[PDB]
Write a protein that binds this ligand. Sequence first.
Ligand code: PC1
Ligand code: PC1
Lengths: 346, 207, 242, 171, 97, 318
Amino acid sequence: MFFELEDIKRRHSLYWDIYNVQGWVRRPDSTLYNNVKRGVTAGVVASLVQENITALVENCKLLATKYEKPQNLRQAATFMKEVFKLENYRKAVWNRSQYALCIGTFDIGARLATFRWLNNGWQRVFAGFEFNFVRKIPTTMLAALFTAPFSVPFELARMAYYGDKTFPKELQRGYSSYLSALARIPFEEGPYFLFKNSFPLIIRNFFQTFTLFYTYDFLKDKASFAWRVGEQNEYACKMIIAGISTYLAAVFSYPWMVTREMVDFWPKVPGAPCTFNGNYRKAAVWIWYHEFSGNYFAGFFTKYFWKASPGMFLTLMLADKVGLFDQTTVDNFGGAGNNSWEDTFV
Amino acid sequence: EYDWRDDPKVNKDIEEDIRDRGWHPETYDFPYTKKHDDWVFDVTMPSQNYQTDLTVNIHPENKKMHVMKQVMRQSYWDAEHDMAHEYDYESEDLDFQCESFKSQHFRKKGPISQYLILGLLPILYFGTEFFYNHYPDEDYWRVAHPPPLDYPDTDDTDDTETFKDYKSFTGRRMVDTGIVDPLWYDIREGKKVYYDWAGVNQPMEDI
Amino acid sequence: LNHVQNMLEENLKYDAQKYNDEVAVIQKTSRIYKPTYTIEFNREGEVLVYSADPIKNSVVYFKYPYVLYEAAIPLFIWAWIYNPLELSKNAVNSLLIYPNIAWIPRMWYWRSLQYKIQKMYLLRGGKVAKIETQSLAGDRFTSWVETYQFHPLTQDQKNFDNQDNAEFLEDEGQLKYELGVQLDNLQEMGTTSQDIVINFMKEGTVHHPELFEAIVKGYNIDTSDYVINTANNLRAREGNHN
Amino acid sequence: MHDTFYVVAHFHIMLSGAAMTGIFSGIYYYFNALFGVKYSRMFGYMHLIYYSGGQWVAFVPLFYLGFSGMPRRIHDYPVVFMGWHSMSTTGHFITLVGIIFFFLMMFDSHIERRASTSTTLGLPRWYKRISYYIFKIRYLQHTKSKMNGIPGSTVRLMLINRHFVEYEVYE
Amino acid sequence: DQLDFSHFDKAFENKYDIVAPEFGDLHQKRAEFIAKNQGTYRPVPLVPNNIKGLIPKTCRLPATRNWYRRTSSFERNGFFNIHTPVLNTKMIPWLLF
Amino acid sequence: MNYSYKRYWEPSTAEVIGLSLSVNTISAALTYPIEFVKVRSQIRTEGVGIRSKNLYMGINPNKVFREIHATGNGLRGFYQGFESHLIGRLSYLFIRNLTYKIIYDRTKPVKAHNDLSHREKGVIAGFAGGLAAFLTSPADLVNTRTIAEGGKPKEWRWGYKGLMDGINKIAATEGGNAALFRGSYANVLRAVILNISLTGPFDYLNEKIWITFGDMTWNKYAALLWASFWGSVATLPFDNIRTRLYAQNADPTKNRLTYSGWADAAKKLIQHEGISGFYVGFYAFYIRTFLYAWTTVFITDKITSDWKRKAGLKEWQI
Ligand SMILES: CCCCCCCCCCCCCCCCCC(=O)OC[C@H](COP(=O)([O-])OCC[N+](C)(C)C)OC(=O)CCCCCCCCCCCCCCCCC
Ligand SMILES: CCCCCCCCCCCCCCCCCC(=O)OC[C@H](COP(=O)([O-])OCC[N+](C)(C)C)OC(=O)CCCCCCCCCCCCCCCCC
């Protein structure tokens, strides 16, 4: 042995079955390098578009608080031109592009790579539907867990960067950009400054990943009769499926981001113990057990939807385009799919 | 009989369930007779009278934060008390019903690990049956492997004969017609190697 | 998450806490109007200050923005039926998408017709006004709204109109134009809704111009000088010419 | 349609779907009477959605197969049925997921440990308008008590609107 | 003495010393500044004042200028109405189709 | 299953020593904060026990981590005493692996597809672990005293700045080299139980998963999770008693409880805390066990497979 446990590898005699083409068969393109490359590409593109969308939306809201919203289309074009002209908009584009690269190469790319690595080998039925999708429930779940905290350090680095930007001159770190802040924080405030009390982010990432990927794969297989039996475009159908999956992911991920508002933003009752004890997990449990589901969905579209949903939608579209949702379908009667060919044609 | 280790104030290691902040099931009487509900005013509707007051406008949207009232926590069983009260002294206790209503058998909740077992009951039952009983057979749930070359015998797995058939005039013409799919493996050395596009695992080694 | 220090976040927390503490439910006001005459409330202690028949005076069917869509519908149906463009199977169905969504603006307009005020009474105490409206299907809605909720809009309704100085009543005392009034919180049918715009049509009778102007301008009207008229003329569900 | 999968679809829709949905309706209707606690809404909604969807998806393709001449008790069938059969099997697994959620909610119902409150407030019938008044008063008081620790409309809107605190350039 | 659990003893104190600020010196200085200057110091994001072609927003605008109509509202006590009167009109076309 | 073993390549003594030292150095460096949290959790509930109820039973590892970080030393504050921990672990592994290799080479079966039954290998591993733990008890004692102080009053702390410094202070103050072996029998029992609680459960579930699901890749990791759970269940009471005996101060005044031996510590744990008082810090202990075992198994398997492929072994023999 090398320590208290011995991994006793054993040899086994061969086995075979009648069919070979509806269980786990790892695909030839499921190597680590290929999965990482494809996931990183899709993630960085989706994240760049999402962060440009966020910067544009928030700088339009910033300009609209000081100037009247446009009345007609010409005024809308002028308003958009002035938004683009803003000094605050260009720096936001640059820094959020750096943030998008960081979260695409390490969070969305990691999610896509892990999902493909765990779910590449689930083959589909030849002229039917993948009936045994329950086998993907643990698998996908694992991926979500394994990729839940991969965005937390980057998100907290972005938060610290902006918080530094908003303090007086004597109390500023002088962060030149987002990458400078990300590189400097672990050696100034420590690595735990990027992970402390990050349960909302972790569980939100978990629900985003699981709901998005599971719903998209399930619908793109189970709703396949929409363009196989009754001939439809399959591209409008794929877009509709991606939109449904994105909406479900955003719905199931938002309530965990309200715990921030409930814990350290709601005014406190003087002389009384603070509810939730400032934990975000007691708050998450209270939300889970709350009777009125509308109380923790206020601000869904104002605070969260238009900052994650376009990114998730483009992530699904680009992942399907590159091929991270493709599964092998082989005839279960002819060729390599069968070991009893004598009953195939009788 | 005061043990500060059991006191949530002195003993800081007793973690507080914030969903049971105002509820102490230890102090629940059976039958329950506490009054924890009454008229609540001065939250949004003031208890004062300003119906005719022209100098006062009521703005309920300025409601102030108050202490959150959690949903009532269900009673938790006391093992010793429940066993003592429901105990019967056979052959020396009369078979009768007490006049008082406190003799009622009230139901109180208990541990939750049993319900952890219950929550995974479908998973455990299906796993038990299919995997533990190995239903329908041993090889059904195993990862699928084709047999090795000509295994167990050429009568069952005639890999070499099919390899020759696909590589002959008739086989090439049949593939040309388009009604027969191409050959899915190659016999390299004495090993049958399936092509990547065949979508199957490789055969297991004959150990 | 909370260990990250943001000055804007701290300002937001301070604003929320200060609004929770200093700003109370009970607010003192000095907007009080004393009418120059004795107010004759009805048997139910409320004086009718505005009456109208908004549905009778509105164009219901042949309204310009919506007749355009409803007349474009047959063109799309014909284009699907005969396929003059030689489109594929999906494109003609995309053509058929339109007829399902072309009557929605008319639905919104017909809904907007029920936010034009049919009746407005001023209850005793001068702090509540009762507003009665009616939908196009004969449903009748009643809403009691505090006087301070009313904010007049301009004639074009594009911008808010200045309170304490605004002329929406002519010299005689009737409405000069269709007046738009915004309500910060209107409880309609038991559901509170924010920023609801109501309209008082020009072809409507403004009884008690002073009381109407004070209610619209968000005044607490002093109804100390009052009498009660014991007239049981009205009935429940009384016909009103829509 | 005798001894075909049309009959199987008919009686499976009826028995499985209707009977088990009514049984679950009774289980949730008598959850406090049966278990002494109130049920959790999240896994209950998941159970409802998945069980109903599974029933439909599993037993409509059986109608399709019954119209095409599929006998009942055959474990092997003509090749032209597999498609719908796969869909049918898919539906069953959806149903199974719903079943899982059912058990989960029961587990989730005993982590919660809340005392159930009847929605009628003790006034099941509004036979008179005085009953309506009593119910309305008690309901408003109950809702006001529930909405304690949740900020007012103005503070909530202030928090929601001013959420974004990430700007590059300040004055 | 100890092992008499009727009154607490200092030997059972599970309190750890505080050697230094948890996240460095500047974090502590910023926390002190926040404690002293929460609300008095208000940074303002930069927006140019005189921009041609844009009408400055002197006052709040009515609901007439809104491009989109909300289907959800707030009760005055904080309750969030999802099922509003607007939701019925919005659900009419989907239900019809 | 006695023909099922695969020992066609046997590493030499130099190979096993070097690989064990390097890989276990990495593994111990990764999970030392988790061990620190577990020891602190065991320390803070000596006379108290588990006082919460239902799902709140036990001590939250994250709460202890947050408190130790809020102390102000950062993550470097979780690596205090790591010198003692690493030296003790490496010495224990050296002695245990040497003795196990010797007794195995004297006793292993002739055929490469045969191996000792888990009972025989368990006896060998228990003897080796007991010997090595007895010899490295001073280092384990210094490490546990370094970790425990901080959750103790100022006058109760020992103040060790290293392993040799701690050993010198223990020998000089308490008196004699017998002072270095305080609670060494507890360490021997812990090592005996730990060396027999992991190989058994791992092979059980690994082979059963293979029988059920064939030759997938997740079988060994699921079996590793199961083996870690059962090893933590078996070993944690002994680890708790070893922590109690190690952290006990020489002065009877400076102690929440005074233990005269292993049995006395167990008796006073049952009296004040109950049976459930043994399993405090179970989540931390189980997580550390699983992470340490996973790191060691993964790296060792990669290295040994690379070595086998260079030795000409066929794929089914690797
Ligand atoms: C002493 C106590 C004994 C207790 C009983 C024995 C253990 C029971 C607990 C098992 C826990 C679950 C382990 C799952 C591990 C799966 C790993 C894997 O990839 O497996 C591949 C297998 C097989 O996937 P497959 O689709 O490739 O294989 C089908 C068969 N061939 C190869 C011919 C195509 O996946 C599953 O079995 C799905 C597992 C999903 C999780 C639920 C597990 C329980 C139910 C399993 C039966 C199937 C019905 C599922 C739906 C209904 C669920 C209620
Ligand atoms: C799950 C991880 C997902 C990662 C996804 C990708 C993330 C990419 C970005 C990473 C950003 C952070 C990189 C930090 C790299 C090191 C920098 C450095 O040297 O910092 C100085 C720090 C030391 O400085 P410091 O921490 O003292 O901080 C200095 C500042 N003061 C003192 C003011 C706070 O270096 C280290 O900490 C390195 C030592 C090894 C740390 C190992 C940690 C193991 C944690 C185990 C789990 C937690 C314990 C158990 C809890 C639960 C128990 C059950």
